[PDB]
TrEMBL record, chain E:
It comes from the Eukaryota. The gene is ND3. Core subunit of respiratory chain NADH dehydrogenase (Complex I) which is composed of 45 different subunits. Interacts with TMEM186. Interacts with TMEM242. Gene3D superfamilies: NADH:ubiquinone/plastoquinone oxidoreductase, chain 3. Core subunit of the mitochondrial membrane respiratory chain NADH dehydrogenase (Complex I) which catalyzes electron transfer from NADH through the respiratory chain, using ubiquinone as an electron acceptor. Essential for the catalytic activity of complex I. Belongs to the complex I subunit 3 family. GO terms for cellular component: mitochondrial inner membrane; respiratory chain complex I. It is a multi-pass membrane protein. The chain crosses the membrane at residues 55-75, 87-104. This is NADH-ubiquinone oxidoreductase chain 3. GO terms for biological process: mitochondrial electron transport, NADH to ubiquinone. Keywords: Electron transport, Membrane, Mitochondrion, Mitochondrion inner membrane, NAD, Oxidoreductase, Respiratory chain, Translocase, Transmembrane, Transmembrane helix, Transport, Ubiquinone. Its main location: mitochondrion. GO terms for molecular function: NADH dehydrogenase (ubiquinone) activity; oxidoreductase activity. It comes from Bos taurus.
């Protein structure tokens, strides 16, 4: 891939997301989704190996099916309303189809099976796009149709995502599958608060993106994709292990780290609506996420695993990866709890 | 007694395909280091054709056996 | 003389520096023939015809005139023949056909008519 | 402007700098076969960059002040110790072999970077493509376990795939009895303990595995001891080569841009030389690892990224 | 109706001709007569085996080009618009982007058949 | 010590240094005038 071609394709991925976000017409929203899927597959196939081919095919089949259900909902909405405006849907069957269509696009459980596999099959840079940028467009549509979403359906997906994400991460030794299951679990929190306060869905989304972007950027820096490969970081870049520790604890929602904020704010919103059993269940089940974050901090930062002799050759060479924005993202990933009231800007 | 640190036996707990072995995952190997699986040994088969003898371009008595790809 | 654009033979590229290329190949042939016994007719004959060709190359700086003197076609054909001769000389060392006849034929093997 | 996609977009493409003198030549042959002397002559006559064979301290010469570092910063791998006790218990034999391969891999990247960046050809003495000959001889002699051989194949399988083989392979073919004689004349005491079986395993590995493979994708030139004496004859053969096979014919700008992006980042090059496969020969524990690493950063001009060490005369650090 | 009548007559006549062709002639059917044809010698393998497509990349590009016509076919009607300034710009824009896509595939050797 | 290959950062990149200092100074001016003009609008609008 010619560098100019990569930029144009990369700009098209953003263009499709932006089209969804600025569109007031259901057709243009669907077009934006198609444009996004068209441009992301070549990024997935960038390295041209059988695994990347499998991931791209599994991704394409899933996203195509969601687009069909989404467009079906739009046409049903047109029959029962005669209009195309992006807003609440006027038919409950259309609401179900759109909600499920967006659930597949996000990778929410039980439409989650593709997220672990696609993420594992593609490079880290592509996985970063998949688990962060690709969340924006479906969430922005959910942010506009939520008044007509069936409450039981959306909360059922949120609960299942948190459980399935929590349990799925416990068995993983690959860093890309850990980030996939962690992503599934975090998506559950975003949609659980969606019916009550959409602002806290945006807050959780932004903070999830900052923390996920930081973790992928640190994995890219040392070119690590397994738990054991990451366990050598202490012997080359000690500073990196400390940043991984702080970021991982934040992702686990431990105060006083930034990652505690979205969980804190979502519990507040749910209790204000006399929803007590669900936030309690959610917070406890999120302890599964913390458990398999803590294993990574054990093998990465708090202990020292054995090295290999050839590691000494890497002591003589500096990191040359861009690590774009890493110093800023890690500070935002960890030291933002004192600034929590700034969430009103999202209002 | 100096501080304990993980040895090889401890580290290999985290080097398998999964953290918790089960009978359904006994056949799983860790993925390739560089994400590249070996190409298949399978040989793609070329179409074999009789070109003649009974053929306008075979002069009536040439049995040209061709192996074609497309 | 201006360099050719084509040798006229398909697949036989035009050589930019024929004189030097010929001197390299003729010298290599003479080097290889030094490992053949002095009494082998292959060495004496190949050395003789080689030294005559090399002497021409050193005395005629014009590719047209040199081609007329060598009588081997285009100068690129002469280079190809030099390469073929060098290939043969190496093979002859393994074969050693200067050795005495390996075997007489049966009595009437070459008698004709029967 | 450090090389990258932007420099490429602005017109820094490999095709603009290559010629018919932009070749990657490797000189091969058994021990004491005249490789290094021949290699220097080829480079001098063709105006190519000569790379002395990569040893235990090759990486040292490319970083810092260029001097060899103390051997604790190389795992204490010792060539002399290999010749004296090839079966030592501490795994010196394979630890040396694994370190040497990674040294050659690093050198090959440095050679390719020079070729692509400047267009000047290079000459190497052996390479990653022929390093396996010593691996094969070591194992056939029982100097390493079968587990070590499998490890080596794993590292080579994920590293040698990302590069292009040399344009020309020069092979000085010296018979084993001659090598055993030349080693005696040389005077190296440790090297004189090399057995004939070991040398016959290197020759067998070369003549049986290396050259047939290189034939299918490189211009392979072979020479005797006496032909190798005159580098002028060798240069003459190289200058009249065809180059009608191998992957170099299928390379274009975007492919060489990708290759250059790899070989200029040395950590990316060395990534898989340290795969977490815990062999006893190459594994090191935290207490030894941590202790040596802290020593490494105390070395002169080694605590900070090059250009940021005041204890070696670097200035303007508060503006860098 | 007329169109449906016309289509039915056309395919009714064709079917009648096939029926006549199959039931009028005297038939003598045996295995060698009906064996697959291949120049006098038995076929070597199945004709259902995969047949490689060398123009596969052109074939996919046809799908994308074959939808440009649907976007361009309304042009004669669009020429009747009051807003001709916007028309002509957008009509020329589509055709140019189609031309650019063709040039890209051409310059990148996408139209060359694989060997 | 003295490096066998010249470091990429042996010499300051004076162009980046000039721009980096210029951006920091420029933003600080913009922030002060911006802030100072927000106060006057706030004072004027509220009768202060
Ligand atoms: C104020 C409101 C916000 C409140 C939220 C909490 C704020 C803290 C958030 C921290 C954000 C991450 C930034 C942490 C900076 C860590 C710096 C440090 O620890 O030193 C790095 C040191 C490097 O070692 P060295 O080889 O000598 O130097 C190489 C680098 N030039 O590294 C090492 O050598 C250490 C290697 C051993 C690992 C030790 C691990 C245990 C100690 C970790 C301490 C940091 C814990 C951070 C976790 C969050 C704590 C709240
Ligand atoms: C890579 C992207 C490539 C994009 C390329 C787009 C090319 C478009 C070129 C401009 C095409 C139209 O160009 C424009 O046409 C209209 C006619 O319709 C002209 O307009 C003229 O005729 C119209 C009506 O026909 C009158 O109302 C108007 O008074 C008069 O100015 C403009 O004078 C001319 O500038
Ligand atoms: C607005 C509509 C009208 C505008 C024209 C739009 C189509 C433009 C088509 C592309 C033209 C340039 O792109 C094209 O690239 C190839 C590179 O493989 C060039 O070169 C190639 O073309 C010809 C034919 O294939 C070969 O004989 C030649 O060996 C090869 O080099 C062409 O000479 C050039 O024409
Ligand atoms: N085990 C091992 N020894 C190696 C390797 N490369 C070199 N050596 C040894 O390092 C020493 C120098 O290598 P050589 O270049 O082949 O020997 P030499 O004396 O220089 O002979 P020349 O070809 O003329 O240069 C020899 O003792 C080699 O056995 C290697 O990849 N593995
Ligand atoms: Mg040497």
């Amino acid at each position: 891939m010619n560098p100019i071609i990569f930029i144009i394709i990369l700009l098209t991925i953003m263009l499709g997301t932006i089209i969804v976000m600025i569109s007031s017409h259901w057709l243009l929203v669907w077009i934006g989704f198609e444009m996004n899927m068209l441009a992301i597959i070549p990024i997935m196939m960038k390295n041209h190996n059988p695994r990347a081919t499998e991931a791209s095919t599994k991704y394409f089949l899933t996203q195509s099916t969601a687009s069909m259900l989404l467009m079906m909902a739009v046409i049903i909405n047109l029959m029962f309303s005669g209009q195309w405006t992006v807003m609440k849907l006027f038919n409950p069957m259309a609401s179900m189809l759109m909600t499920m269509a967006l659930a597949m696009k996000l990778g929410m459980a039980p439409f989650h099976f593709w997220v672990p596999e696609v993420t594992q099959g593609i490079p880290l840079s592509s996985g970063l796009i998949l688990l962060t940028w690709q969340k924006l467009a479906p969430m922005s549509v959910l942010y506009q149709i939520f008044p007509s979403i069936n409450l039981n359906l959306i909360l059922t997906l949120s609960v299942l995502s948190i459980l399935i994400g929590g349990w799925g991460g416990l068995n993983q030794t690959q860093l890309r599958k850990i980030m996939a299951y962690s992503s599934i679990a975090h998506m559950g929190w975003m949609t659980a608060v969606l019916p009550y306060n959409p602002t806290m869905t945006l807050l959780n989304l932004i903070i999830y993106i900052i923390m996920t972007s930081t973790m992928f950027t640190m994995f890219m820096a040392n070119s690590t994709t397994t738990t054991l490969s990451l366990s050598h970081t202490w012997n080359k870049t000690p500073i990196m292990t400390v940043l991984i520790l702080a970021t991982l604890l934040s992702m686990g929602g431990l105060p006083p780290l930034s990652g505690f904020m979205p969980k804190w704010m979502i519990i507040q919103e749910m209790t204000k609506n006399n929803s007590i059993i669900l936030p309690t269940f959610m917070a406890i089940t999120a302890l599964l996420n913390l458990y398999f974050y803590m294993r990574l901090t054990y093998s990465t930062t708090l202990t020292m695993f054995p090295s290999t002799n050839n590691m000494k050759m890497k002591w003589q060479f500096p990191l040359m990866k861009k690590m774009t924005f890493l110093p800023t993202m890690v500070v935002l990933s960890t030291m933002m709890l004192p600034l929590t009231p700034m969430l009103s800007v999202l209002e | 007694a100096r501080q304990w640190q993980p040895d090889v036996e401890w580290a290999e707990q985290y080097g398998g395909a999964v953290m918790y072995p089960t009978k359904e995952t006994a056949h799983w190997k860790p993925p390739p280091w560089n994400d590249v699986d070996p190409p298949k040994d399978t040989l793609v088969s070329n179409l074999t054709l009789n070109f003649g003898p009974q053929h306008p371009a075979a002069h009536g008595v040439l049995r040209l056996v061709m192996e074609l790809s497309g | 003389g201006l360099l050719k654009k084509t040798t006229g033979l398909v697949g036989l590229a035009v050589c930019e520096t024929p004189h030097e290329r010929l001197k390299i190949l003729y010298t290599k042939i003479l080097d290889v023939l030094g490992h053949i016994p002095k009494n082998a007719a292959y060495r004496k004959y190949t050395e003789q015809i080689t030294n005559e060709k090399l002497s021409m190359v050193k005395a005629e700086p014009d590719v047209k005139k040199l081609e007329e003197r060598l009588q081997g076609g285009q100068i690129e054909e002469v280079i190809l023949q030099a390469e073929n001769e060098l290939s043969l000389a190496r093979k002859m060392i393994q074969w050693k056909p200067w050795e005495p006849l390996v075997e007489e034929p049966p009595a009437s093997q070459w008698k004709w008519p029967i | 402007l450090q090389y990258g996609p932007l420099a490429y977009i602005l017109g820094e493409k490999a095709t603009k700098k290559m010629t018919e003198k932009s070749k990657l030549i490797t000189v091969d042959g058994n021990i004491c076969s005249g490789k290094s002397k021949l290699a220097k002559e080829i480079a001098e006559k063709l105006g190519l960059k000569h790379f002395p064979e990569a040893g235990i301290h090759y990486v040292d010469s490319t970083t810092g002040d260029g001097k060899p570092l103390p051997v604790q910063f190389s795992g204490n791998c010792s060539l002399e110790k290999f010749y004296d006790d090839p079966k030592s218990n501490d795994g010196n034999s394979y630890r040396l072999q694994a370190w040497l391969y990674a040294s050659r891999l690093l050198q090959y990247a440095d050679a390719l970077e020079h070729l692509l960046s400047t267009g000047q050809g290079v000459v190497l003495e052996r390479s990653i493509y022929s390093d396996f000959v010593f691996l094969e001889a070591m194992y056939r002699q029982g100097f390493i376990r079968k587990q070590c051989v499998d490890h080596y194949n794993q590292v080579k399988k994920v590293t040698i795939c990302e590069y292009l083989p040399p344009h020309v392979v020069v092979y000085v073919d010296v018979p084993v009895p001659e090598v055993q004689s030349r080693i005696q004349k040389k005077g190296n005491p440790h090297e004189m303990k090399i057995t004939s079986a070991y040398l016959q395993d290197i020759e067998n590995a070369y003549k049986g595995t290396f050259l047939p493979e290189m034939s299918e994708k490189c211009e392979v030139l072979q020479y005797s001891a006496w032909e190798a004496q005159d580098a002028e004859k060798v240069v003459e053969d190289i200058e009249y080569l065809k180059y009608d096979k191998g992957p170099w014919l299928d390379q274009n700008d975007r492919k060489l841009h990708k290759l250059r992006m790899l070989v200029q980042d040395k950590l990316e090059v060395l990534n898989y030389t340290s795969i977490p496969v815990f062999l006893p020969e190459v594994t090191v524990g935290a207490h030894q690892s941590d202790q040596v690493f802290q020593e490494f950063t105390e070395l002169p001009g080694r605590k900070y990224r090059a250009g940021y060490n005041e204890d070696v005369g670097d200035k303007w650090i508060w503006l860098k | 109706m007329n169109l449906m009548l016309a289509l039915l007559t056309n395919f009714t006549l064709a079917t009648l001709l096939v029926i006549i062709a199959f039931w009028l002639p005297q038939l003598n059917v045996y295995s060698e007569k009906t064996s697959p044809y291949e120049c006098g010698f038995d076929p070597m393998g199945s004709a259902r085996l995969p047949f490689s497509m060398k123009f596969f990349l052109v074939a996919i590009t046809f799908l994308l080009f074959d939808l440009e016509i649907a976007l361009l076919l309304p042009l004669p009607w669009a020429s009747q618009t009051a807003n001709l300034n916007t028309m002509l710009t957008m009509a020329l824009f589509l055709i140019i982007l189609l031309a650019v896509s063709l040039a890209y595939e051409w310059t990148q050797k996408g139209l060359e058949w694989t060997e | 010590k003295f490096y066998i290959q010249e470091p990429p950062h042996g010499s300051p990149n004076w162009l980046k240094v000039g721009l980096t200092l210029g951006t920091s100074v420029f933003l600080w001016i913009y922030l002060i005038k911006q802030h100072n003009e927000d106060v006057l609008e706030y004072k004027r609008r509220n009768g202060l």
